[PDB]
Paper text:
Ribosomes are fundamental to all forms of life on earth. Their activity is regulated via chemical modifications of the four rRNA species: 25S, 18S, 5.8S, and 5S. Here, we report the structure of a plant cytosolic ribosome and a quantitative mass spectrometry analysis of its rRNAs. The overall structure of a plant ribosome is generally conserved relative to its eukaryotic counterparts, including in regions that are responsible for the binding of mRNA and tRNAs.
Author numbering:
A (entry chain R): 2 to 151
B (entry chain M): 2 to 142
C (entry chain D): 1 to 25
D (entry chain T): 2 to 130
E (entry chain N): 2 to 99
Amino acid sequence: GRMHSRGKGISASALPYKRTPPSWLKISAPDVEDNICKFAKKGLTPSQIGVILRDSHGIAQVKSVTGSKILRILKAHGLAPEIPEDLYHLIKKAVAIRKHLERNRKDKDSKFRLILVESRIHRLARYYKKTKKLPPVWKYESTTASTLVA
Amino acid sequence: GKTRGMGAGRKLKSHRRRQRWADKSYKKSHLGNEWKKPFAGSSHAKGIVLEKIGIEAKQPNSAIRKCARVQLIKNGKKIAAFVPNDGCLNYIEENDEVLIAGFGRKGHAVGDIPGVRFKVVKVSGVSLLALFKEKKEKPRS
Amino acid sequence: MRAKWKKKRMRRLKRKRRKMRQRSK
Amino acid sequence: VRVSVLNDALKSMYNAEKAGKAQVELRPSSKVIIKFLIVMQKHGYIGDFQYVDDHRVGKIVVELNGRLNKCGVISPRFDVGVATIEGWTARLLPSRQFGYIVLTTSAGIMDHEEARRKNVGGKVLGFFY
Amino acid sequence: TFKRRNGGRNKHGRGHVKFIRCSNCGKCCPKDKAIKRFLVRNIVEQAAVRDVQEACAFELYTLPKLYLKMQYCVSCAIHSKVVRVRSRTDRRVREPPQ
RNA sequence: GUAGGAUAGUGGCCUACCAUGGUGGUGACGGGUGACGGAGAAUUAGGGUUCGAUUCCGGAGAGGGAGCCUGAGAAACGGCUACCACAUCCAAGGAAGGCAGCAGGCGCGCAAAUUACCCAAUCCUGACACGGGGAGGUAGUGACAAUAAAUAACAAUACCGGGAGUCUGGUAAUUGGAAUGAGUACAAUCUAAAUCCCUUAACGAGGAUCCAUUGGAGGGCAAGUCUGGUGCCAGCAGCCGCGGUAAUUCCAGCUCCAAUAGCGUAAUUUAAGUUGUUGCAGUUAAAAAGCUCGUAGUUGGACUUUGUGUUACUUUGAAGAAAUUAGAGUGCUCAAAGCAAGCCUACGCUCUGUAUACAUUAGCAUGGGAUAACAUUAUAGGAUUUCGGUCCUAUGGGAUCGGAGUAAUGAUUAACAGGGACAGUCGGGGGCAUUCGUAUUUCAUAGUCAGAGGUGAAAUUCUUGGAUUUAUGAAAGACGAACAACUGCGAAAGCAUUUGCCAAGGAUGUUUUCAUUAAUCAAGAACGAAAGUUGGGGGCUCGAAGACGAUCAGAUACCGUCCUAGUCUCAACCAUAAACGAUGCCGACCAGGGAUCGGCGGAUGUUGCUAGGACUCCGCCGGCACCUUAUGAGAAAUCAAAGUUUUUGGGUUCCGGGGGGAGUAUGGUCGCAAGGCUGAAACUUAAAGGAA
Ligand SMILES: [K+]
Ligand SMILES: [K+]
Ligand SMILES: [K+]
Ligand SMILES: [K+]
Ligand SMILES: [K+]
Ligand SMILES: [K+]
Ligand SMILES: [K+]
Ligand SMILES: [K+]
Ligand SMILES: [K+]
Ligand SMILES: [K+]
Ligand SMILES: [K+]
Ligand SMILES: [Mg+2]
Ligand SMILES: [Mg+2]
Ligand SMILES: [Mg+2]
Ligand SMILES: [Mg+2]
Ligand SMILES: [Mg+2]
Ligand SMILES: [Mg+2]
Ligand SMILES: [Mg+2]
Ligand SMILES: [Mg+2]
Ligand SMILES: [Mg+2]
Ligand SMILES: [Mg+2]
Ligand SMILES: [Mg+2]
Ligand SMILES: [Mg+2]
Ligand SMILES: [Mg+2]
Ligand SMILES: [Mg+2]
Ligand SMILES: [Mg+2]
Ligand SMILES: [Mg+2]
Ligand SMILES: [Mg+2]
Ligand SMILES: [Mg+2]
Ligand SMILES: [Mg+2]
Ligand SMILES: [Mg+2]
Ligand SMILES: [Mg+2]
Ligand SMILES: [Mg+2]
Ligand SMILES: [Mg+2]
Ligand SMILES: [Mg+2]
Ligand SMILES: [Mg+2]
Ligand SMILES: [Mg+2]
Ligand SMILES: [Mg+2]
Ligand SMILES: [Mg+2]
Ligand SMILES: [Mg+2]
Ligand SMILES: [Mg+2]
Ligand SMILES: [Mg+2]
Ligand SMILES: [Mg+2]
Ligand SMILES: [Mg+2]
Ligand SMILES: [Mg+2]
Ligand SMILES: [Mg+2]
Ligand SMILES: [Mg+2]
Ligand SMILES: [Mg+2]
Ligand SMILES: [Mg+2]
Ligand SMILES: [Mg+2]
Ligand SMILES: [Mg+2]
Ligand SMILES: [Mg+2]
Ligand SMILES: [Mg+2]
Ligand SMILES: [Mg+2]
Ligand SMILES: [Zn+2]
């Protein structure tokens, strides 16, 4: 189930068996990749780029039209952020809890959740260093974490 | 449950090593406290009869078990040795050399005799069995 | 004897030893 | 987590067989499971099984015929040379006349009788009878 | 030997339940274990309704009722006969009696 | 590390100088061993447990250390020098000492033989065919251990059976003739010489006294409810028990039983699936850490050819001491053994035989490539030809920098794994501030008059100085009723008046994103009811301790009255609970049924309502539970998991091994303390315990 709770939820997306684009989808691969680069330069992340394409352009899966995932397209154009998106959001959450916790010393529930979030940061950072998606000497520092994110 | 991994050889071996100590039979032999027993790991032992004593049989029996306090010659420890058979205490005199043996339960008390774990086998170099059956006689008088 | 009170009796007995041993140090 | 997909597949079949079911679904599928089934199929312990493609791992529906007493994995997968096959059969099989231990050898997945004929050793996957 | 599947109380999926105080002796008892009875009766006993109704100063008046919620500990419920010891089979019957 | 010195020679082996390294939870370092290592030994269905001083191999020592000469070889001890420890002789000035060689003695002990003969065999050594050999062999002692094997056989009578009868079988210190080695002994043989054995003249059995023993006869456990004695004594009894005047159990006789030239008694294997890898347990019997995080460790979804990256694994082979083990051959009379022998009858033969297998792990070498581990991948420093430049170097090669080509140019999928984003929600989840509620207590005002309180009954206690009771109002602190449930939230502890703010979260929804990032976790961390500790605030109520009134034989209690700490709060500690589901976490599978909580999908017609909400019906996912049932499990109680277990193996952590002593002593560590964590032994005991 969940990494840091007893939850056993299974809700998730279910990809269709048809990997090809629908017959009613006329946009070509060069046009799609032009929009993906256009959104990345505006600051959007791979997760929220695909949401816009699905909701406003009828592109259910970018891979079906272009043959590559959104992050791969951004890397080919030098638009992949230095810190991966998912690791970035964990750091932002840890910063928020610490900022809240400095004014609330007796909020022991927050202190408990801060430990879980930071341990989740270190498990993900370890993986990214092994796959060389982070600098080899990159290290998460609570003192300077708030400067990275936000 | 049990650890099953093919690479878990160390944990299984070390786990058993720790758990064997929980076994009373294993711990009695590997503790080293057997050497501190009056026999100090020996099957028999010679000693000097200090006095002839009687011990009240444990309940629900009622009798006076004839024993003898013996000081072991090799280490000077004093023990109580039961004298078996009928009227064999008359064959034992104080300050006499007696061969002692275990009572049969490896240092545990036997029967209704309280706190007695030794018995007398020989007296003055002669077995009590031979004296009891009038095979031999004690060397004196 | 109730286990709780036997536990209480032993703790009292340990305090005296703790005090009867630190008396000479 | 899912550690041995083979154990889930064989455990599902064994439970289904005892309940007297005619079919049973195995998920996920693997080429080890398929080759294990083929060994059972050749000896007439299961009927026809069908692999369903779902673009992720696939699924298998196995037809049962009521001949399978038990089938299970051996974990961990111990090494078994040809000379030690006799000891394993004396442990896992009902008798010296039926029942097969499935091995993975460098020559492929096969039962212990075929392994003796080819004089090849390997590792134990499971057994059935 | 475990006597009841519920352990004598009604608690699932929670750690602690605050206690109440027995209406009879004041003993502390978890609210989910206490025997609760909600008594509703006329504020005037049936032996005095006729006399009070004859002395009424109003042409129409409904005598109010007395609402009292009683929460007993186990010892008081058994002693006061609010509940009785039941046989092993009858212990499982949870429906109120007739 | 560099340079030397020394050594037969490598090397911090040693010196000078320089550097700051080396080892460690994959257990260094230290401690224990009644520890020489191995070949092996015992027991072993398999796996295993225990042992290994001792004849083969290796090492080490010669009373303890050290030093050394001679020599090819020794840090030699049946060589020397010194010290220390023991000890011999002396004319007292000196001198000589090393049995853990053989025998022998003392001592120690439960515990172990002759101060014998010989170089004949085996082999070793010297100048040596010849000498020497306490190595070695021979004999003596020898119930360590092992092998074979006597203590009678037969017939006829008497007696007694079975298949009136008669064949067969059984008993007798009856009666008969036969057999024979134990013993004894001419002899020969044996042997280096003797001795024993083998062979053999004579001799050698009737109660064939040429006398079988050791333990038993209640049960376990084969064998007596026999007779005499004893009377809870004496004694027996491994365990259960026997014995108190009619003892199957003690002491005896008789009889019977077991093994038998043997048998009894006092570490270790088996039994023990009571150490469990194979293969055990942990709801209640002993045993899930209070809870979560977390490193090492251990374990990790699917996918790539079917029809000079590194390893594990598997196959075959090579190498491997003998002895032992297994095993082939062989009639030492058999046997344990031994390694011999066999064939015929010549001046001999079978080249006579003296096989073979096994031998963990590590190492070496072939074949196999499923399973599995590690490593690797997208600015290819890519593969592949071809055309140059430059440099170096032989009788072309190498290195390096470029051009132009060739090609399908080069990225598995998106787990009813996990993480992250997003969406509308949901909750008594947490923190901060804030609102309200009656009650209680106190006080104020007013009214009234004799009791009020409390108990089983009373009394302590309050009260005409106005108690209790009634109305109004104020203050204080606590608490948050009813609603409130086999309901919710939280990792657990725990969480319940309103509203706002702050961060967090599960589930659901999703054709969003990453792509194995995971599971469980030594070490190490966060949180952890109540009580308790330190200080400040507060101090209604209740209330350990204390005091008093009752009750009582007593009452340090239960009941009543008053009350301290405490109860509330802040800062800081403590880390324990029946912290319980007495049930660790992750994953798969395996019956039925209704209800309920959250989210979503579909259908439907009602609302004193503003598509939606409320309700009705169908379904999906997730959660707290309940009900029926066994095809399951279990000692059962009972459990839809405590099921899918002798048809035993999904992954992982913790933890138990009869009852006590004892969560005690001691050491360590944490704490202000209280204590927490870690945690024995001596000794004691035949039951304790679970379910029914
Ligand atoms: K979701
Ligand atoms: K083991
Ligand atoms: K109840
Ligand atoms: K050297
Ligand atoms: K050097
Ligand atoms: K020489
Ligand atoms: K010789
Ligand atoms: K010679
Ligand atoms: K077995
Ligand atoms: K703490
Ligand atoms: K449900
Ligand atoms: Mg799941
Ligand atoms: Mg985890
Ligand atoms: Mg399991
Ligand atoms: Mg009871
Ligand atoms: Mg819950
Ligand atoms: Mg609780
Ligand atoms: Mg040098
Ligand atoms: Mg130096
Ligand atoms: Mg040894
Ligand atoms: Mg030694
Ligand atoms: Mg040895
Ligand atoms: Mg020794
Ligand atoms: Mg010797
Ligand atoms: Mg030797
Ligand atoms: Mg030497
Ligand atoms: Mg000596
Ligand atoms: Mg020397
Ligand atoms: Mg000598
Ligand atoms: Mg010598
Ligand atoms: Mg001896
Ligand atoms: Mg005789
Ligand atoms: Mg008798
Ligand atoms: Mg019998
Ligand atoms: Mg008698
Ligand atoms: Mg007996
Ligand atoms: Mg045991
Ligand atoms: Mg057990
Ligand atoms: Mg208990
Ligand atoms: Mg228990
Ligand atoms: Mg795999
Ligand atoms: Mg997925
Ligand atoms: Mg609710
Ligand atoms: Mg309320
Ligand atoms: Mg720990
Ligand atoms: Mg606390
Ligand atoms: Mg505890
Ligand atoms: Mg517990
Ligand atoms: Mg755990
Ligand atoms: Mg628990
Ligand atoms: Mg619903
Ligand atoms: Mg049921
Ligand atoms: Mg098992
Ligand atoms: Mg125990
Ligand atoms: Zn009550």
